[PDB]
Amino acid sequence: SHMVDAFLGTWKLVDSKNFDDYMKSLGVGFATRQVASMTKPTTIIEKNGDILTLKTHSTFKNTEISFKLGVEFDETTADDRKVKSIVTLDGGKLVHLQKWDGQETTLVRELIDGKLILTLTHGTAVCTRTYEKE
């Protein structure tokens, strides 16, 4: 299909709200939170055959996940959590669910009014990061 085509490309952060709150919720220490809060990472979304790849590149930490929609995969997050993940795409919302230690967090990407909105949710901690395509 072509459902993912609109997401493919290079995206740069233009705005962020409550990232600190989301990070601390995850157990990320103060020193790391300051450094992470200063960065403007670039996420690169790409497709190869049936497999999607999502790279996050910054002057601080770099990560990369590869997955097929609806298929579980192992992931080591930037804050070093070893999680089991699953990514699905429904109604144009790319939903990434991470599960570890009996708890979970979601990372949701949607294209709205010319921006990519990434909503990060861990319990009542909800962060919104805004990206724009290059």
Ligand SMILES: CCCCCCCCCCCCCC(=O)O
């Ligand atoms: C670049 C973030 C450095 C600090 C690592 C904190 C890890 C929090 C989970 C990953 C958050 C990534 C959000 C995003 O892609 O913009």
Ligand code: NI
């Ligand atoms: Ni296409």
